[PDB]
Amino acid sequence: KVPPDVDPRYQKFLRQHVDADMSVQKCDRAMSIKKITAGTGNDCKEVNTFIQATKDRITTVCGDAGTPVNNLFKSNQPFPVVTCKLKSGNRRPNCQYRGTSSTRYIVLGCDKGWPVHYDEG
Incomplete structure (x- = not known):
């Protein structure tokens, strides 16, 4: 069970940042389709990364496999990611993105062992 004061943030993190089958195209x-906008309302979110891994493996960054960095937690090894950056458009549905796949040490906000935030950098 995920605690209930954590669940809303954790579910939003999964939706916005966890997708093993994501790709640049x-x-x-x-x-x-995941309805990822710039906080409430319909502006096109500028940058959003999808970590190409399962939620359980990503959650280990908030557990045994992560290290503290400031108030967040950094993976002990690169993770595969696809970053989507807004090329044009101001509000849905006109958003257009360019995707880049790369590998990097990911930094997460964690709460009671669950991931609740992705640090884009």
């Missing part, structure tokens, strides 16, 4: 449809 899917940025537009992923941002659209």
Whole structure:
């Protein structure tokens, strides 16, 4: 069970940042179907990364496999990611993205062992 004061944030993190089958060509449809906007309302979110891994493995960053960095937690090894960056458009549905796949040490906000935030950098 995820605690209830953590569950809303954790579910939003999964939706916005966890997708093992993501790819660079899917940025537009992923941002659209997961309804990822700039906080409340309909502006096009500028940057959003999808970590290409399972939720359980990513959650280990908040557990045994992560290290503290400031108030967040950094993976002990690179993770595969696809970053979607807004190329044009101001509000849904006109958002257009360019995707880049890369590998990097990911930094997460964690709460009671669950991931609740992704640090884009």
